[PDB]
Amino acid sequence: SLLPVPYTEAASLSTGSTVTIKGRPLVCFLNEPYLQVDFHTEMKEESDIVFHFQVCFGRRVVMNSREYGAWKQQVESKNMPFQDGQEFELSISVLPDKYQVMVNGQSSYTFDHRIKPEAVKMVQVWRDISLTKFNVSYL
Amino acid sequence: SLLPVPYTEAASLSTGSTVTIKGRPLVCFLNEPYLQVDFHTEMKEESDIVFHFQVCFGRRVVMNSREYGAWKQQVESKNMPFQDGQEFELSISVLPDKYQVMVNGQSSYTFDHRIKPEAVKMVQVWRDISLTKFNVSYL
Ligand SMILES: OC[C@H]1O[C@@H](O)[C@H](O)[C@H](O)[C@@H]1O
Ligand SMILES: OC[C@H]1O[C@@H](O)[C@H](O)[C@H](O)[C@@H]1O
Ligand SMILES: OC[C@H]1O[C@@H](O)[C@H](O)[C@H](O)[C@@H]1O
Ligand SMILES: OC[C@H]1O[C@@H](O)[C@H](O)[C@H](O)[C@@H]1O
Incomplete structure (x- = not known):
């Protein structure tokens, strides 16, 4: 069943x-x-953002950081592996130098670390989706 | 209590x-x-849009129409009467020539009719809000 959004x-x-x-x-x-x-960087939603990932379905993806309350330099991708009307699986892997973003098992986006990933305390998933699964794992 | 969004x-x-x-x-x-x-113009969410009103809270408002599936010329306002953290009352009045948009009883946006308002069959309210009240009335 659905997780709260x-x-x-x-x-x-x-x-x-x-x-x-x-x-x-x-x-x-x-x-x-x-x-x-x-x-x-904190449980509070107004806290700084190490990694911001925003999909406008069918249009584009933007990635950024928000540091001491201020947004930094946006990165833009027109890559759109998400399919109209379909369930997606998004996985975000922490590599030594970057985040690797897979969509439905396909490498789709990367974003170099601006802040060490150890600074992260909370993940928020939101906007115009239904959510069936959220997992943090380690290999 | 809350209406579905x-x-x-x-x-x-x-x-x-x-x-x-x-x-x-x-x-x-x-x-x-x-x-x-x-x-x-229809009950279906993919139907044409006589009047599109999108608030990015704290940033801007865009208004447009979507005609035969195609978006038209965007109108932009930096007017932001919406208050951080607060309940709002939005009212959209159909005038002879335009929509009048009031926020918390203040005239905030207008948008000239591109298509007669009689073409409207459905209103959708969505994105990152909770909704306590929705009413269509006439004077
Ligand atoms: O460049 C400033 C903007 O960067 C984008 O990546 C964020 O999603 C915000 O919209 C921010 O305001
Ligand atoms: O985001 C930059 C690039 O990241 C790689 O991991 C993806 O395979 C795509 O080639 C993408 O263009
Ligand atoms: O100009 C094209 C764009 O117009 C905006 O007003 C709409 O919100 C859509 O984002 C559309 O794609
Ligand atoms: O949207 C255009 C204008 O519409 C009027 O109704 C409002 O009072 C504001 O002056 C706004 O700038």
Whole structure:
């Protein structure tokens, strides 16, 4: 059954951590639903963001950090492996130098560490999705 | 108590119709929650949009139409009467030539009719809000 959205979970990340999310957009891509995943430095939603991942389904992905309350330099990708109307599996792996983002088992986005992943205390998953699965694992 | 979000209601609009919404953003403005209100030509969410109203709380408002599946020329306002953390009352009045948008009883946005308001069959209210009230009335 469905997890509450927004979904907030305490987390610790290091090299070899994976965050796995299964959900589905609430509406068709023509209506531009969003998905956002934020790796926060505190449990509080207003805390700094080590890794901001925002999908505008059918359009683009932006990634950023929010440091001392201020947004930094946006990275943009037009890569769109998400399929209109379908369930997705998103997995975000912590590599030594970067986050690796897989969608449905395909390498789709990377983002170099601006802040050590050890600074993360919380993950929030929110915007226009239903969520069936959220897991933090380690290998 | 809370109405389901996304919230979809069949509606007929003409000169003197008002759409009144009461809700609150799910999260602080620093996190840029959205509100969207769409006046659709059919019950189907993929149908054309006579009036698209999208708030990025703390940042801006965009208004548009979506005609034969294609988005038209965006109108942008930096007007932001919405208050961080607070309940809002949004009312959208159908005037002869335009929609008048009031926030907490203050005139905030207008948008000239591109399509007669009689073409509207459905209103959808969605994105990062909780909704306590939705009413269509006439004077
Ligand atoms: O560049 C500033 C903007 O960066 C984007 O990546 C964020 O999603 C926010 O919209 C922010 O305001
Ligand atoms: O985000 C940058 C790049 O990351 C890689 O991991 C992906 O395989 C795509 O090639 C993408 O363009
Ligand atoms: O100009 C095209 C864009 O217009 C905006 O007003 C809509 O919200 C959509 O994002 C659309 O894709
Ligand atoms: O949207 C255009 C204008 O609409 C009026 O109704 C409002 O009072 C604001 O002056 C706004 O700038």
